[PDB]
Amino acid sequence: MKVRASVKRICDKCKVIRRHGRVYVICENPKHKQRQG
Amino acid sequence: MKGILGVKVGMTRIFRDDRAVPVTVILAGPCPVVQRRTPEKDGYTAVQLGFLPQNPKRVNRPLKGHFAKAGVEPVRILREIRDFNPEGDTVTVEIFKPGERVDVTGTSKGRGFAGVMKRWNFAGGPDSHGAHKIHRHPGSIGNRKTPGRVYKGKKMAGHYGAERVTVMNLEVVDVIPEENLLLVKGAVPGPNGGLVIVRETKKA
Amino acid sequence: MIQPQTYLEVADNTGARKIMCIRVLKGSNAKYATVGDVIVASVKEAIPRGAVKEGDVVKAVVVRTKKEIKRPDGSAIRFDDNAAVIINNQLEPRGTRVFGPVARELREKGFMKIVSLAPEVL
Amino acid sequence: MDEIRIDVMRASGPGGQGVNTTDSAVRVVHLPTGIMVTCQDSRSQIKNREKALMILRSRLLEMKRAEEAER
Amino acid sequence: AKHPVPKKKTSKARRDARRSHHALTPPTLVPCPECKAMKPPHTVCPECGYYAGRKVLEV
Amino acid sequence: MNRGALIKLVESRYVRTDLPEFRPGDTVRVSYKVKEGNRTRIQDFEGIVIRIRRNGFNTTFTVRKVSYGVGVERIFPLHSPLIQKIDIVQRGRARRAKLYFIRNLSDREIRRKLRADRKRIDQDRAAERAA
Amino acid sequence: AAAKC
Amino acid sequence: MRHLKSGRKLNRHSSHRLALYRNQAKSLLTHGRITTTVPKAKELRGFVDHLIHLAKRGDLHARRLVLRDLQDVKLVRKLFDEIAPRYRDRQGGYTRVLKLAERRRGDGAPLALVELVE
RNA sequence: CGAUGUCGGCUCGUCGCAUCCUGGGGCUGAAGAAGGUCCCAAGGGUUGGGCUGUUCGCCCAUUAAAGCGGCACGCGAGCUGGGUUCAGAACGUCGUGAGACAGUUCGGUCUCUAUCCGCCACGGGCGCAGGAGGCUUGAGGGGGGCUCUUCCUAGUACGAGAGGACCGGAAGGGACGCACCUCUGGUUUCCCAGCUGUCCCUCCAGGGGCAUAAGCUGGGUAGCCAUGUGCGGAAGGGAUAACCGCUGAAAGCAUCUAAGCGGGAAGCCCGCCCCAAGAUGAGGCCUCCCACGGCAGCCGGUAAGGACCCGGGAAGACCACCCGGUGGAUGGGCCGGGGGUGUAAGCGCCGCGAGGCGUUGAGCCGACCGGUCCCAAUCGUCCGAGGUCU
Ligand SMILES: [Mg+2]
Ligand SMILES: [Mg+2]
Ligand SMILES: [Mg+2]
Ligand SMILES: [Mg+2]
Ligand SMILES: [Mg+2]
Ligand SMILES: [Mg+2]
Ligand SMILES: [Mg+2]
Ligand SMILES: [Mg+2]
Ligand SMILES: [Mg+2]
Ligand SMILES: [Mg+2]
Ligand SMILES: [Mg+2]
Ligand SMILES: [Mg+2]
Ligand SMILES: [Mg+2]
Ligand SMILES: [Mg+2]
Ligand SMILES: [Mg+2]
Ligand SMILES: [Mg+2]
Ligand SMILES: [Mg+2]
Ligand SMILES: [Mg+2]
Ligand SMILES: [Mg+2]
Ligand SMILES: [Mg+2]
Ligand SMILES: [Mg+2]
Ligand SMILES: [Mg+2]
Ligand SMILES: [Mg+2]
Ligand SMILES: [Mg+2]
Ligand SMILES: [Mg+2]
Ligand SMILES: [Mg+2]
Ligand SMILES: [Mg+2]
Ligand SMILES: [Mg+2]
Ligand SMILES: [Mg+2]
Ligand SMILES: [Mg+2]
Ligand SMILES: [Mg+2]
Ligand SMILES: [Mg+2]
Ligand SMILES: [Mg+2]
Ligand SMILES: [Mg+2]
Ligand SMILES: [Mg+2]
Ligand SMILES: [Mg+2]
Ligand SMILES: [Mg+2]
Ligand SMILES: [Mg+2]
Ligand SMILES: [Mg+2]
Ligand SMILES: [Mg+2]
Ligand SMILES: [Mg+2]
Ligand SMILES: [Mg+2]
Ligand SMILES: [Mg+2]
Ligand SMILES: [Mg+2]
Ligand SMILES: [Mg+2]
Ligand SMILES: [Mg+2]
Ligand SMILES: [Mg+2]
Ligand SMILES: [Mg+2]
Ligand SMILES: [Mg+2]
Ligand SMILES: [Mg+2]
Ligand SMILES: [Mg+2]
Ligand SMILES: [Mg+2]
Ligand SMILES: [Mg+2]
Ligand SMILES: [Mg+2]
Ligand SMILES: [Mg+2]
Ligand SMILES: [Mg+2]
Ligand SMILES: [Mg+2]
Ligand SMILES: [Mg+2]
Ligand SMILES: [Mg+2]
Ligand SMILES: [Mg+2]
Ligand SMILES: [Mg+2]
Ligand SMILES: [Mg+2]
Ligand SMILES: [Mg+2]
Ligand SMILES: [Mg+2]
Ligand SMILES: [Mg+2]
Ligand SMILES: [Mg+2]
Ligand SMILES: [Mg+2]
Ligand SMILES: [Mg+2]
Ligand SMILES: [Mg+2]
Ligand SMILES: [Mg+2]
Ligand SMILES: [Mg+2]
Ligand SMILES: [Mg+2]
Ligand SMILES: [Mg+2]
Ligand SMILES: [Mg+2]
Ligand SMILES: [Mg+2]
Ligand SMILES: [Mg+2]
Ligand SMILES: [Mg+2]
Ligand SMILES: [Mg+2]
Ligand SMILES: [Mg+2]
Ligand SMILES: [Mg+2]
Ligand SMILES: [Mg+2]
Ligand SMILES: [Mg+2]
Ligand SMILES: [Mg+2]
Ligand SMILES: [Mg+2]
Ligand SMILES: [Mg+2]
Ligand SMILES: [Mg+2]
Ligand SMILES: [Mg+2]
Ligand SMILES: [Mg+2]
Ligand SMILES: [Mg+2]
Ligand SMILES: [Mg+2]
Ligand SMILES: [Mg+2]
Ligand SMILES: [Mg+2]
Ligand SMILES: [Mg+2]
Ligand SMILES: [Mg+2]
Ligand SMILES: [Mg+2]
Ligand SMILES: [Mg+2]
Ligand SMILES: [Mg+2]
Ligand SMILES: [Mg+2]
Ligand SMILES: [Mg+2]
Ligand SMILES: [Mg+2]
Ligand SMILES: [Mg+2]
Ligand SMILES: [Mg+2]
Ligand SMILES: [Mg+2]
Ligand SMILES: [Mg+2]
Ligand SMILES: [Mg+2]
Ligand SMILES: [Mg+2]
Ligand SMILES: [Mg+2]
Ligand SMILES: [Mg+2]
Ligand SMILES: [Mg+2]
Ligand SMILES: [Mg+2]
Ligand SMILES: [Mg+2]
Ligand SMILES: [Mg+2]
Ligand SMILES: [Mg+2]
Ligand SMILES: [Mg+2]
Ligand SMILES: [Mg+2]
Ligand SMILES: [Mg+2]
Ligand SMILES: [Mg+2]
Ligand SMILES: [Mg+2]
Ligand SMILES: [Mg+2]
Ligand SMILES: [Mg+2]
Ligand SMILES: [Mg+2]
Ligand SMILES: [Mg+2]
Ligand SMILES: [Mg+2]
Ligand SMILES: [Mg+2]
Ligand SMILES: [Mg+2]
Ligand SMILES: [Mg+2]
Ligand SMILES: [Mg+2]
Ligand SMILES: [Mg+2]
Ligand SMILES: [Mg+2]
Ligand SMILES: [Mg+2]
Ligand SMILES: [Mg+2]
Ligand SMILES: [Mg+2]
Ligand SMILES: [Mg+2]
Ligand SMILES: [Mg+2]
Ligand SMILES: [Mg+2]
Ligand SMILES: [Mg+2]
Ligand SMILES: [Mg+2]
Ligand SMILES: [Mg+2]
Ligand SMILES: [Mg+2]
Ligand SMILES: [Mg+2]
Ligand SMILES: [Mg+2]
Ligand SMILES: [Mg+2]
Ligand SMILES: [Mg+2]
Ligand SMILES: [Mg+2]
Ligand SMILES: [Mg+2]
Ligand SMILES: [Mg+2]
Ligand SMILES: [Mg+2]
Ligand SMILES: [Mg+2]
Ligand SMILES: [Mg+2]
Ligand SMILES: [Mg+2]
Ligand SMILES: [Mg+2]
Ligand SMILES: [Mg+2]
Ligand SMILES: [Mg+2]
Ligand SMILES: [Mg+2]
Ligand SMILES: [Mg+2]
Ligand SMILES: [Mg+2]
Ligand SMILES: [Mg+2]
Ligand SMILES: [Mg+2]
Ligand SMILES: [Mg+2]
Ligand SMILES: [Mg+2]
Ligand SMILES: [Mg+2]
Ligand SMILES: [Mg+2]
Ligand SMILES: [Mg+2]
Ligand SMILES: [Mg+2]
Ligand SMILES: [Mg+2]
Ligand SMILES: [Mg+2]
Ligand SMILES: [Mg+2]
Ligand SMILES: [Mg+2]
Ligand SMILES: [Mg+2]
Ligand SMILES: [Mg+2]
Ligand SMILES: [Mg+2]
Ligand SMILES: [Mg+2]
Ligand SMILES: [Mg+2]
Ligand SMILES: [Mg+2]
Ligand SMILES: [Mg+2]
Ligand SMILES: [Mg+2]
Ligand SMILES: [Mg+2]
Ligand SMILES: [Mg+2]
Ligand SMILES: [Mg+2]
Ligand SMILES: [Mg+2]
Ligand SMILES: [Mg+2]
Ligand SMILES: [Mg+2]
Ligand SMILES: [Mg+2]
Ligand SMILES: [Mg+2]
Ligand SMILES: [Mg+2]
Ligand SMILES: [Mg+2]
Ligand SMILES: [Mg+2]
Ligand SMILES: [Mg+2]
Ligand SMILES: [Mg+2]
Ligand SMILES: [Mg+2]
Ligand SMILES: [Mg+2]
Ligand SMILES: [Mg+2]
Ligand SMILES: [Mg+2]
Ligand SMILES: [Mg+2]
Ligand SMILES: [Mg+2]
Ligand SMILES: [Mg+2]
Ligand SMILES: [Zn+2]
Ligand SMILES: [Zn+2]
């Protein structure tokens, strides 16, 4: 899980979701998982 | 949850499977059920035990009436065992079998006014190298202007011991029922002749 | 009760005569070693042309203590010296002979070759 | 400067209340080689940091200029 | 030490509140059965010399 | 109650009376049941009784012997079940209840200070003449 | 008594 | 702590307290009754009773034992010939402490008499 | 600036979390093992040494780890005083000089008494609408909270091999904490013995004083103790963090989420141990006494009870607490046992003698376990309800 202030899509299969008040990027590539923080 | 009142007899050690077993001997039996606390009447469950018969010439009228409602001879000590409802009207050492684990509560030995070293295992001060009249002193007790005070609960000199202490999970080495003797492995709070309480362990 | 600074005689033929304990190899911060414990030690006195020499930092197991060891049977045993046998990192002795009696506690603690070589186990 | 560690601390010797409470002394450590240079030549940490880094560089230079010579 | 010292004069109210414990208690006295004189219990009567029903000392 | 009697009553099941009387200064052989890995064997520990501290059933005694060039002191409970038997090997005559001072004595020095206790040696020889 | 020098 | 310690100190070192009990013993065996402070009187009972009981035994050994404290052969002679016979059938309790009513003026000390029992 | 004592150490902590370790995770260029990196997590833990006044740093040997910071760079009415920071002296250096120096060197007075707050202990008072003796609930506090190694699973899964698991299960430690004194080991101010010099008793013998506030020496009960012994950290229930899901739209797909549901930390709540109804919100139960006499008040005499006084106590500074007070085993004595010391004196025998042998495990003998009214806790005195209103 990448934890950073700038979360973006990294590849075309990335998905930006907002769950539980936080921005996440989820993806079939597990490297691309991001949490904003 | 079973329990009984008793007196610390003294220590010795026995041999069992070619091992010295330090034991404390307790005289626990017998304890007559004097009152049972019930949820209906008292809001909780407990058995008020008696222990040691007392010279009825020394038992005032409020207490005599209390024993009378139980049909029980006057007794020196009344203690409740909490959450215990024995079947009979008497509790004896038989409630314990060798191999069980018990909790023992007693009144520790009283150190009186105790120094910071005896009471709290403080290091004290040096004994040479110029140490000036502080060899057993506690050192600093605070900071400076912030917070400008001393915490509650600060470890200081004061009275030590003669307080309720419970030592836990002691092995019942033997039960000699004809003498109302319980043998427990290890050490038990307080002096010989002290009152103790023997409950089933809460350790699992 | 062996601790840093403590001197021990050497009950083997490695050539070391006196080692000085510098560590009790027993967890984070053991205060003392007794029989069967291992120490790290400096070699303070040795006979010429031995296995180990003065100044070496070595490992050894304690085999005798002047502080009496107590036993589950209720007995105890006490020696006139503090003595140790120099070992390697596999716990085996580095000399071929063990001088003097050793505590039977060593058997219980896997120092069998030492127990083997000692002329008396007590 | 990423392979360099700079320690600051109180200096030794005279100064009164100043030298007691001031982090004027500096050590610079070349982390790969381990060689250090210290400086409390002045009263100022910044001047001692500057002078210490100079001497450290000059010394690592002579070390580099000397292995080059031995080759 | 550094010679601690009262920071303020103690008020008349405070010093007298300190002394709220200083009143003497009167001495415990029982009548001597022999001569009826008041004297401390468990002491030989200093008036008639009696204790425990008999004479113990001259007076 | 009588707390002393209760403790003596607890202890009485573990008390022995088969062992011979001895005194500090006597040479004694304790045959001691010792477990070794798996089995148990009897190991003889023979030496001078340098101390008997008494406390009823809790009496213990200390025996000293020079073993392969090293002094060894073993401390024995007098009522331990691990003791097979104690044989009196010799009666020595001492002047004090505790013989700590023999740790710093030479061989002849102990020989001189703890001499054969003829009286109790004759008492031992007169007994065993009860056939 | 030491000094604030 | 002083737990289960027997024996009063009376703010005297070991030899002063020993000499104190000896001298109070001499005065008591001499006059039969002496006044002293309450704590001293209580401690004196056992010191003197022991010397009287040994006198009741009467052997030479006891006499020399009593002599170590009393030092006075006349007083010991009075102890064995006059004092001790009075107590042949008495099993201890040879001394009596009763407390006085009025304190010492100059220091407030509570006083008591110590006497040999009849 | 009519003074806010300045470094380091010591002592005692306490807090933060940007986490050194231990617990939980995601990613990995994660095969396993071991690491990297980031996230959650402050409950606990965070060693001993060499050098230097050192802080700092380096080094040695270990460790799960050897965290970083705040608290007047925490803490000198708590200690230290090596450094700094006066007066002496000296070196280098500067100055004609007197002298001078974040240059060096050796030396150099750190103040018995705590009033108020605060803190640790402990009482006194009143209150808790009758007066009392017990026994209690637990609001609310506090304590505690660490971790390692080996073994089995299994030399298995994984790996070419070297190496080597998860999960689960046993065993053994280190440090710390509480209590304890059976054992081990201390102390043991007079419990025993031995020894010198001197003076004395009483000449011998036997003893006493003094040589320390034990003359010295060898021992040493109880107690108080650690180095010794027992036991503790949990288990378990609940709710969570990061993180992982189930079902699922908005948004035909997808989505841990917007409705709802799971799983999930040494942390959080409970659980454990201790305090605790001044919890003035002053609680509950069992028992006892009871409508007394005189103009929600007063005045006495009483009740059940209590206090005073006394004998004491592994309780204790005083106070308090606890037991006992002649219907008594509470202290003291006496007796028996334990325990210590280690064979008393006197006598007889052997020796020229110093001595030795026997009587003899004798004599002495604190406190420990008991017995016994021999001595003392005599005799008493004073308090102390009559119960507001709806
Ligand atoms: Mg970017
Ligand atoms: Mg997706
Ligand atoms: Mg108790
Ligand atoms: Mg209790
Ligand atoms: Mg107590
Ligand atoms: Mg204790
Ligand atoms: Mg102290
Ligand atoms: Mg301590
Ligand atoms: Mg303590
Ligand atoms: Mg210390
Ligand atoms: Mg110390
Ligand atoms: Mg000192
Ligand atoms: Mg000083
Ligand atoms: Mg001071
Ligand atoms: Mg001093
Ligand atoms: Mg202090
Ligand atoms: Mg201040
Ligand atoms: Mg300060
Ligand atoms: Mg403040
Ligand atoms: Mg108390
Ligand atoms: Mg406790
Ligand atoms: Mg267990
Ligand atoms: Mg059994
Ligand atoms: Mg019985
Ligand atoms: Mg050797
Ligand atoms: Mg050798
Ligand atoms: Mg050398
Ligand atoms: Mg060399
Ligand atoms: Mg070897
Ligand atoms: Mg940096
Ligand atoms: Mg500085
Ligand atoms: Mg310096
Ligand atoms: Mg200057
Ligand atoms: Mg100077
Ligand atoms: Mg500054
Ligand atoms: Mg001071
Ligand atoms: Mg001061
Ligand atoms: Mg001072
Ligand atoms: Mg002052
Ligand atoms: Mg003022
Ligand atoms: Mg004032
Ligand atoms: Mg004023
Ligand atoms: Mg006024
Ligand atoms: Mg005034
Ligand atoms: Mg006041
Ligand atoms: Mg006034
Ligand atoms: Mg006052
Ligand atoms: Mg008054
Ligand atoms: Mg006992
Ligand atoms: Mg020999
Ligand atoms: Mg001889
Ligand atoms: Mg003989
Ligand atoms: Mg004390
Ligand atoms: Mg006390
Ligand atoms: Mg003291
Ligand atoms: Mg006593
Ligand atoms: Mg005395
Ligand atoms: Mg005094
Ligand atoms: Mg005095
Ligand atoms: Mg005085
Ligand atoms: Mg005086
Ligand atoms: Mg003296
Ligand atoms: Mg006289
Ligand atoms: Mg007269
Ligand atoms: Mg007088
Ligand atoms: Mg006097
Ligand atoms: Mg006596
Ligand atoms: Mg005669
Ligand atoms: Mg009286
Ligand atoms: Mg006067
Ligand atoms: Mg006066
Ligand atoms: Mg009086
Ligand atoms: Mg100023
Ligand atoms: Mg002023
Ligand atoms: Mg001012
Ligand atoms: Mg001022
Ligand atoms: Mg801190
Ligand atoms: Mg964080
Ligand atoms: Mg972690
Ligand atoms: Mg982890
Ligand atoms: Mg892995
Ligand atoms: Mg790999
Ligand atoms: Mg990771
Ligand atoms: Mg992350
Ligand atoms: Mg933490
Ligand atoms: Mg370190
Ligand atoms: Mg050195
Ligand atoms: Mg150092
Ligand atoms: Mg340093
Ligand atoms: Mg430095
Ligand atoms: Mg490491
Ligand atoms: Mg690790
Ligand atoms: Mg500071
Ligand atoms: Mg600091
Ligand atoms: Mg400070
Ligand atoms: Mg100071
Ligand atoms: Mg300071
Ligand atoms: Mg201050
Ligand atoms: Mg100050
Ligand atoms: Mg202060
Ligand atoms: Mg101040
Ligand atoms: Mg200085
Ligand atoms: Mg100085
Ligand atoms: Mg000046
Ligand atoms: Mg010059
Ligand atoms: Mg000029
Ligand atoms: Mg010039
Ligand atoms: Mg010049
Ligand atoms: Mg200059
Ligand atoms: Mg200068
Ligand atoms: Mg400078
Ligand atoms: Mg200098
Ligand atoms: Mg110089
Ligand atoms: Mg200087
Ligand atoms: Mg000097
Ligand atoms: Mg002073
Ligand atoms: Mg005050
Ligand atoms: Mg104030
Ligand atoms: Mg206050
Ligand atoms: Mg109160
Ligand atoms: Mg009510
Ligand atoms: Mg009421
Ligand atoms: Mg009550
Ligand atoms: Mg009561
Ligand atoms: Mg409760
Ligand atoms: Mg609570
Ligand atoms: Mg409150
Ligand atoms: Mg809590
Ligand atoms: Mg924990
Ligand atoms: Mg395997
Ligand atoms: Mg498998
Ligand atoms: Mg392998
Ligand atoms: Mg496992
Ligand atoms: Mg802790
Ligand atoms: Mg403790
Ligand atoms: Mg204890
Ligand atoms: Mg004992
Ligand atoms: Mg002991
Ligand atoms: Mg011992
Ligand atoms: Mg004596
Ligand atoms: Mg003499
Ligand atoms: Mg003579
Ligand atoms: Mg004289
Ligand atoms: Mg003198
Ligand atoms: Mg001297
Ligand atoms: Mg003497
Ligand atoms: Mg001694
Ligand atoms: Mg000793
Ligand atoms: Mg003792
Ligand atoms: Mg002892
Ligand atoms: Mg003891
Ligand atoms: Mg203790
Ligand atoms: Mg310990
Ligand atoms: Mg443990
Ligand atoms: Mg745990
Ligand atoms: Mg859950
Ligand atoms: Mg769908
Ligand atoms: Mg889905
Ligand atoms: Mg939802
Ligand atoms: Mg959930
Ligand atoms: Mg799941
Ligand atoms: Mg409670
Ligand atoms: Mg209440
Ligand atoms: Mg309560
Ligand atoms: Mg109110
Ligand atoms: Mg109300
Ligand atoms: Mg409230
Ligand atoms: Mg109310
Ligand atoms: Mg109430
Ligand atoms: Mg309730
Ligand atoms: Mg009361
Ligand atoms: Mg008292
Ligand atoms: Mg009191
Ligand atoms: Mg008073
Ligand atoms: Mg008192
Ligand atoms: Mg009073
Ligand atoms: Mg009473
Ligand atoms: Mg009465
Ligand atoms: Mg009695
Ligand atoms: Mg008695
Ligand atoms: Mg007494
Ligand atoms: Mg005996
Ligand atoms: Mg004996
Ligand atoms: Mg003889
Ligand atoms: Mg004789
Ligand atoms: Mg003779
Ligand atoms: Mg003779
Ligand atoms: Mg002759
Ligand atoms: Mg002889
Ligand atoms: Mg004896
Ligand atoms: Mg005597
Ligand atoms: Mg006697
Ligand atoms: Mg006796
Ligand atoms: Mg005992
Ligand atoms: Mg009777
Ligand atoms: Mg009366
Ligand atoms: Zn992607
Ligand atoms: Zn009268």
PDB file of N, CA and C (backbone and C1' of nucleotides) in Angstrom, chain I residues 235-246:
ATOM      1  P     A I 235      -3.380 -13.808  26.712  1.00  0.00           P
ATOM      2  O5'   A I 235      -4.344 -14.976  27.186  1.00  0.00           O
ATOM      3  C5'   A I 235      -3.892 -16.317  27.193  1.00  0.00           C
ATOM      4  C4'   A I 235      -4.840 -17.202  27.949  1.00  0.00           C
ATOM      5  C3'   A I 235      -6.270 -17.226  27.435  1.00  0.00           C
ATOM      6  O3'   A I 235      -6.444 -18.068  26.307  1.00  0.00           O
ATOM      7  C1'   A I 235      -6.279 -16.971  29.784  1.00  0.00           C
ATOM      8  P     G I 236      -7.143 -17.515  24.962  1.00  0.00           P
ATOM      9  O5'   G I 236      -8.593 -17.079  25.444  1.00  0.00           O
ATOM     10  C5'   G I 236      -9.476 -18.028  26.026  1.00  0.00           C
ATOM     11  C4'   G I 236     -10.579 -17.354  26.796  1.00  0.00           C
ATOM     12  C3'   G I 236     -11.376 -16.304  26.043  1.00  0.00           C
ATOM     13  O3'   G I 236     -12.348 -16.856  25.172  1.00  0.00           O
ATOM     14  C1'   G I 236     -10.783 -15.454  28.152  1.00  0.00           C
ATOM     15  P     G I 237     -12.754 -16.106  23.805  1.00  0.00           P
ATOM     16  O5'   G I 237     -13.750 -14.954  24.271  1.00  0.00           O
ATOM     17  C5'   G I 237     -14.998 -15.281  24.857  1.00  0.00           C
ATOM     18  C4'   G I 237     -15.705 -14.069  25.414  1.00  0.00           C
ATOM     19  C3'   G I 237     -15.861 -12.878  24.484  1.00  0.00           C
ATOM     20  O3'   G I 237     -16.889 -13.026  23.526  1.00  0.00           O
ATOM     21  C1'   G I 237     -15.106 -12.116  26.560  1.00  0.00           C
ATOM     22  P     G I 238     -16.694 -12.430  22.048  1.00  0.00           P
ATOM     23  O5'   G I 238     -16.866 -10.855  22.233  1.00  0.00           O
ATOM     24  C5'   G I 238     -18.038 -10.304  22.817  1.00  0.00           C
ATOM     25  C4'   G I 238     -17.849  -8.850  23.176  1.00  0.00           C
ATOM     26  C3'   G I 238     -17.425  -7.926  22.050  1.00  0.00           C
ATOM     27  O3'   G I 238     -18.489  -7.583  21.189  1.00  0.00           O
ATOM     28  C1'   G I 238     -16.136  -7.454  23.963  1.00  0.00           C
ATOM     29  P     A I 239     -18.225  -7.410  19.615  1.00  0.00           P
ATOM     30  O5'   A I 239     -17.625  -5.946  19.494  1.00  0.00           O
ATOM     31  C5'   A I 239     -18.257  -4.860  20.131  1.00  0.00           C
ATOM     32  C4'   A I 239     -17.328  -3.687  20.212  1.00  0.00           C
ATOM     33  C3'   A I 239     -16.589  -3.339  18.942  1.00  0.00           C
ATOM     34  O3'   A I 239     -17.399  -2.658  18.016  1.00  0.00           O
ATOM     35  C1'   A I 239     -15.102  -3.251  20.750  1.00  0.00           C
ATOM     36  P     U I 240     -16.955  -2.558  16.483  1.00  0.00           P
ATOM     37  O5'   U I 240     -15.723  -1.554  16.497  1.00  0.00           O
ATOM     38  C5'   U I 240     -14.549  -1.859  15.766  1.00  0.00           C
ATOM     39  C4'   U I 240     -13.382  -1.067  16.274  1.00  0.00           C
ATOM     40  C3'   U I 240     -12.255  -0.834  15.287  1.00  0.00           C
ATOM     41  O3'   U I 240     -12.546   0.207  14.385  1.00  0.00           O
ATOM     42  C1'   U I 240     -11.347  -1.493  17.353  1.00  0.00           C
ATOM     43  P     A I 241     -11.746   0.346  13.008  1.00  0.00           P
ATOM     44  O5'   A I 241     -10.219   0.571  13.432  1.00  0.00           O
ATOM     45  C5'   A I 241      -9.722   1.828  13.879  1.00  0.00           C
ATOM     46  C4'   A I 241      -8.209   1.885  13.806  1.00  0.00           C
ATOM     47  C3'   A I 241      -7.606   1.505  12.474  1.00  0.00           C
ATOM     48  O3'   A I 241      -7.657   2.559  11.538  1.00  0.00           O
ATOM     49  C1'   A I 241      -6.403   0.446  14.216  1.00  0.00           C
ATOM     50  P     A I 242      -8.251   2.283  10.081  1.00  0.00           P
ATOM     51  O5'   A I 242      -6.991   1.805   9.258  1.00  0.00           O
ATOM     52  C5'   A I 242      -5.851   2.634   9.172  1.00  0.00           C
ATOM     53  C4'   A I 242      -4.619   1.801   9.006  1.00  0.00           C
ATOM     54  C3'   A I 242      -4.654   0.832   7.844  1.00  0.00           C
ATOM     55  O3'   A I 242      -4.301   1.466   6.631  1.00  0.00           O
ATOM     56  C1'   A I 242      -3.884  -0.275   9.784  1.00  0.00           C
ATOM     57  P     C I 243      -5.021   1.079   5.256  1.00  0.00           P
ATOM     58  O5'   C I 243      -5.016  -0.517   5.225  1.00  0.00           O
ATOM     59  C5'   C I 243      -3.855  -1.256   4.883  1.00  0.00           C
ATOM     60  C4'   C I 243      -4.027  -2.729   5.185  1.00  0.00           C
ATOM     61  C3'   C I 243      -5.132  -3.446   4.430  1.00  0.00           C
ATOM     62  O3'   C I 243      -4.805  -3.751   3.087  1.00  0.00           O
ATOM     63  C1'   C I 243      -5.276  -4.030   6.693  1.00  0.00           C
ATOM     64  P     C I 244      -5.975  -3.889   1.987  1.00  0.00           P
ATOM     65  O5'   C I 244      -6.692  -5.251   2.379  1.00  0.00           O
ATOM     66  C5'   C I 244      -5.951  -6.458   2.478  1.00  0.00           C
ATOM     67  C4'   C I 244      -6.830  -7.611   2.886  1.00  0.00           C
ATOM     68  C3'   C I 244      -8.134  -7.735   2.133  1.00  0.00           C
ATOM     69  O3'   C I 244      -7.976  -8.258   0.825  1.00  0.00           O
ATOM     70  C1'   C I 244      -8.530  -8.059   4.435  1.00  0.00           C
ATOM     71  P     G I 245      -9.065  -7.894  -0.295  1.00  0.00           P
ATOM     72  O5'   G I 245     -10.437  -7.949   0.514  1.00  0.00           O
ATOM     73  C5'   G I 245     -11.598  -8.558  -0.013  1.00  0.00           C
ATOM     74  C4'   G I 245     -12.209  -9.524   0.967  1.00  0.00           C
ATOM     75  C3'   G I 245     -13.696  -9.773   0.782  1.00  0.00           C
ATOM     76  O3'   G I 245     -13.936 -10.736  -0.225  1.00  0.00           O
ATOM     77  C1'   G I 245     -13.255  -9.336   3.062  1.00  0.00           C
ATOM     78  P     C I 246     -14.985 -10.450  -1.403  1.00  0.00           P
ATOM     79  O5'   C I 246     -16.373 -10.826  -0.728  1.00  0.00           O
ATOM     80  C5'   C I 246     -16.533 -12.069  -0.076  1.00  0.00           C
ATOM     81  C4'   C I 246     -17.817 -12.107   0.705  1.00  0.00           C
ATOM     82  C3'   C I 246     -19.053 -11.602  -0.013  1.00  0.00           C
ATOM     83  O3'   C I 246     -19.604 -12.557  -0.900  1.00  0.00           O
ATOM     84  C1'   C I 246     -18.993 -10.717   2.174  1.00  0.00           C
TER      85        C I 246
END
